[PDB]
Amino acid sequence: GRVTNQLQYLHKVVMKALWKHQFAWPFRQPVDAVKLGLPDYHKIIKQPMDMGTIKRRLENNYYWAASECMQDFNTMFTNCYIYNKPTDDIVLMAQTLEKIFLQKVASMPQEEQELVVTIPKN
């Protein structure tokens, strides 16, 4: 992957804010559907995603574009709304985190640029 202004902002502003939120802990690691007794979880949710995975990907420069990172966040939230019950607090926790995510994306640099300056050689 690579480092862009938007990806660096996602890592050290957006993820920084979301990871330490009071509601973050259910989303810091993948759903353990075996331990939690949810053997329909992976039947219903085709793309599991969590902030621990996203954070590791940001740390390892896995993403090529901010859009891929934003789609992982988006999928994480949507998974929660699709699987759980409308009245579960976990849904309201996801909704709270997603509102912060959106507000941070609003303030992200507008145009993605790779963080690179090269001296012409050859």
Ligand SMILES: COc1cc(C(=O)NC2CCN(C)CC2)ccc1Nc1ncc2c(n1)N(C1CCCC1)CC(F)(F)C(=O)N2C
């Ligand atoms: C092992 O970690 C947990 C442990 C306990 C746990 O053991 N809680 C008990 C601790 C002791 N008291 C006495 C009772 C609850 C509860 C939840 C845990 N973790 C978790 N992570 C993610 C999700 C989730 N849960 N959701 C919740 C909804 C309600 C039941 C799972 C369902 C979900 F579908 F997987 C989902 O979408 N998300 C986002």
